[PDB]
Design a protein around this nucleic acid. Sequence first.
RNA 1: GGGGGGAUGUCCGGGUCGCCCUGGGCACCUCUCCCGGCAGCCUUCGCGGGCAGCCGUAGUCCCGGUUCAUACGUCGCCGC
Lengths: 51, 276, 772, 103, 54
Amino acid sequence: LTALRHRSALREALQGRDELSVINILRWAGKYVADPRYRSICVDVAFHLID
Amino acid sequence: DAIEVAGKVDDVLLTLNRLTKSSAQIIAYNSKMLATKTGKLLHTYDESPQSLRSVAGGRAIVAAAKEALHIGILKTKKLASWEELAYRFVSFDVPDIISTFDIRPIIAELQDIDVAVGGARGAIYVYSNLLAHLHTLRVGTIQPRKYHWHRRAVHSVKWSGDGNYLISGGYETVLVLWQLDTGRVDFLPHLSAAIENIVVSPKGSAYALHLDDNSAMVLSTAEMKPSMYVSGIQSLVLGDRPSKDALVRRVWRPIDEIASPLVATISPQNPSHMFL
Amino acid sequence: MDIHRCRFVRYPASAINAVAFTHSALPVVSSSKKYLQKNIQVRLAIGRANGDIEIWNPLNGGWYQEVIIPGGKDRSVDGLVWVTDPDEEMADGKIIHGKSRLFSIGYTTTITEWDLEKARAKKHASGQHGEIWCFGVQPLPAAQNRKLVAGTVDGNLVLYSIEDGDLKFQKTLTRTPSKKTKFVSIAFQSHNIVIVGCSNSTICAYDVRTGTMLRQMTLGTDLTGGSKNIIVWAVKCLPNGDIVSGDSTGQVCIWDGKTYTQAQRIQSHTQDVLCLSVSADGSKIISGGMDRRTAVYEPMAGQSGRWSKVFHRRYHQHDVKAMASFEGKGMSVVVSGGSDASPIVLPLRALGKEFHRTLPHLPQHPTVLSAPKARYILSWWENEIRIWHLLNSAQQFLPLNLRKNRKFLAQVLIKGASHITSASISEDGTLLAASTPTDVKVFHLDPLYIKKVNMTGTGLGATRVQISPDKRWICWAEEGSKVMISRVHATESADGISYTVSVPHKLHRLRRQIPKHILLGGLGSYDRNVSQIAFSADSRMLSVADLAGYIDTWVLRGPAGERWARNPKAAMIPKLSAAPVVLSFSPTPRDDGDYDLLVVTTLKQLLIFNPLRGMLSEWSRRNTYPKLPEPFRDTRDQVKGIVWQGQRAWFYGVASLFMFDLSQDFSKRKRGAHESGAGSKIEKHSLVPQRIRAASAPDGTKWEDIEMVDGSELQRLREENRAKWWHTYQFRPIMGIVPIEGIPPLEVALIERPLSEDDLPERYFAEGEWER
Amino acid sequence: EAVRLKGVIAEAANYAKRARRALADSAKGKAMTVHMSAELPLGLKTDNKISTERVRSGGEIVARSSRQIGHFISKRRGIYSIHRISEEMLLGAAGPTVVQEAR
Amino acid sequence: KNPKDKRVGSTAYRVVSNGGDPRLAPKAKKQSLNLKQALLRRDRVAKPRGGFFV
RNA sequence: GGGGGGAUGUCCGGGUCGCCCUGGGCACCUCUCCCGGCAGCCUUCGCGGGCAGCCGUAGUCCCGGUUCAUACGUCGCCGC
């Protein structure tokens, strides 16, 4: 996910999904916003999923 | 070019000089003709001219407009006197903005030429036979073979030796080789920088690359390792010839600029070296 | 005019599996010999995956879909082959052209021969073998003794005989030793040499007379994925003898003709090449794969027998399963049908010089019908009829209520296995009639409650059905060409109205004067089957019209002593220049008791008839074809239908929408340009150079231009006998425009069908060939 | 409390601004998807007008054809809509009135 | 379809059946139609079908 | 976006009462110049300059509704 923020493609990685895999990436984002060692990347993924 | 004036082959120079900004004219000179600074005028063409190349000998010369291409065959055989140095020219529009071209001669006569025009949209158009298509008012339908792999503009296209392969290189840092007898394509993909210029050796063995990060590597074929590597200072340059993919209005148009100074230290314990 | 756009009619797209022209190529003649090839009937047959075999007409670039013959449920069409005899000559020098018979396979052991005159299947032949997967007709060197060769699943090349109106399983040439060899494609190199592709990586070359084997060409593994056996999906033969074969690796191999070894491997596609096509003079190869990719190859200059890919392009939206070429009468096209139901016509000799053309996937008949007094819209496909009711106006809605506005009212399922060829509904929607090619069924409706009115006397099916506006006459087209009619008696009771349909009283059509060689040659009596059946607005006058251009009308003579008589003025109504694409009466009555029968043909010839007078109206004396507007003359889409207003007639093609005020009179695409049978000349972006200029005078002031080439007395009377027109292209995939009520105001239901990826089948990708 | 109200009120204000733009263009007749009722939609998404430019390979910018603009508008319609053509349109002056089913 | 056969134990009495295909077309063999597809999708898998849906 | 006008539709004091207008609210078409972009053609080595410019929005005869992706050299097991 840091490589997908550095190469400008996180929106492209998230934009083609379906319902179950959106739930899967949301479940990862919810489970792993807690660690402040990747809070930034995890919050950015949650931004793109909300948008 | 080395042409035969009477029986003495010598150098003729073919200059491409502007007369207006989007027009230019091509003008030939001998050495003694260059000493008196009068030139034999050959063509004036009027669509932002880029470059001029000629085949071995001086029979066919190829001039390049932005969208068009001017093929010229010399009118008489054997070139009896100097005052009859005249070229018949036929112009036709290439489908894309011409970045480069390489011509190979099909031969001690000159039977045909094969033109490979690398355009600024990414494609390489191979016009297979030209003198037998424009030798004959009316012409038959000519249709180039399109080879599209590069995303950005293709910086250099060259035929390779025997004529089986079409080697090429663009912004994507990959030397590509069109197989051209099959449909296949094989490539040396991850160089340091953009393949800005290629040449082929007099024999078929070596290629020599001018890489965009101020470098030249003489590669050998199918060992594909640089048998000669030469590197320069690689700092930021305000380029003279601007860019080959700044022609077609991309998302970020490449600008010749220096925004910040170069970050460099001469290193103590070894003051001949410079980290930058 | 108020419009309800409607996209909820899920009309099913079906995958095209077989495209087959009548003649592969015609002999080139001059302009002084133009009258020799005028009666040559060139037709294109396209067979879809739902078993629909439907004939097209190229029409010198018109591309009019004439007949659709649907197969039943669980029935597909895989291969199509026309068998065209050579030109026979009479005693006097007249020319009888070749009778062309259409054969098909349906993933069975049975080869079917189709009767395009009766619009049903003519014959069946089957032998004890596996399912036939590929077949072809033996080419001409004998004259009257031509034979079909068919490969199959279990191996054995069966050989069928066709002579004197026969199709029978003659014998079996050979079969492979390995039982796991499946024959997938077949093409003839000469009169006696058959080239078959197989599933076990081989291209075998059998010899038909003795049934022997010349040579077994082979191909390697596929080293791109698993599944070591390569599969040669399409073989074809060049005119100089070489064999071109597209296979499972997406390659195109050029095999030598004399030695039967390969001469070239051209890696072209990523997924497998599914179909090939070869130009008639042997100069261009078109390859269509499963990566929705079409690639065009021309020979490399210099060395002989060496081909190379000029250019490729993705014309379709799914795989390119079938294509076939045609080159004659100033028209070199190649028609490629795939799985997105859209036949794409490419120009062959001007490829890279003219745009292609995507023919409509929706049928030519509108297949959308409405009872406007009941506001029922109605559409039919495979065996169901879907009827929607709309419950409200449009003036009421000037968005939470638009979902409740439409209502999926009824879905009528037809028994049996046949398919609904046509239907019709009464103006109040209580009478519906649907025609299969086996039976003509009639249903009575009560606002639902549906009952089946017992039909008697029919039982041979029909292709067109119309119900009278006073709900008294039911007129159908039995076996395509025999127009029949029946009175229906409506007897009221204490429960309601009930319908008894009488015995069908066949009315006879006029004996037209057609020469014997035209009636023998061509497709035969194919253009007799009536395409349109149109009643008047008060049902005192019938008219029918066929594909040849003939319009035959009938009047009603009353006293149940009502009976239909032929119009005395019927012979004055002439044969049109082309097939009538729409034909209907004016609902606004005249002042002399006469009708105004509007006809538009496939050549944009809008005209109006006074059929009781037997002549054209004075409005159509005034407004000829050169007086029509340019956005109606240059549409390239066939006018699918009309809807009426008072003084205005609205036309709809597939993409266009027009209105003409028929009261007033009338006063970009090049007209002088001569192009091929697909699209106009290109303008901006092309591989082919446009402006070639030569240069004398080395100062460059003198250039050249090298061209690249391989009623003036009538109108005085017609004006001494003495605007409002509009067009739009914003309703793009129109399948049907139908009027509703509830210059007068009129609501209308425009029904579109844009094809989606949810409608098209699933694309298939392995690990290596994923798309961007 | 000011933080919570800041976030909510800023998002509602930005949606109201862009929805005012889209409703002005739909009143002009460019036929975009707008929400009808007075509650906020679930996704605070407005349809923008289609840009005049297209990004071709490899990164270049060309003009959008009106053909492709019409294709994207045909995507932007729904499954049911009432599209009233006026006599002023048939004369050639004004534009239509579209009322589409709320998706 | 066809009425199924009735066996006494030794012999089998069966109604003949050819009333399915009068003049229309012969019904496609589903085992052969699925075989040609299985030669077309050898090891390859479908892309995910639609949009946002269960 | 503003500066401004001609014209569409409208209520509140209204007016001899009609053409509408002034005072308030205004949404749209059209004109006008500056704002951001894009191209051509002259000038100069370039820098810049000059000339007549188009676009900032909507649906097409067919049709760019396309073309475009980064190799080989060798695989397996276990240990630190």
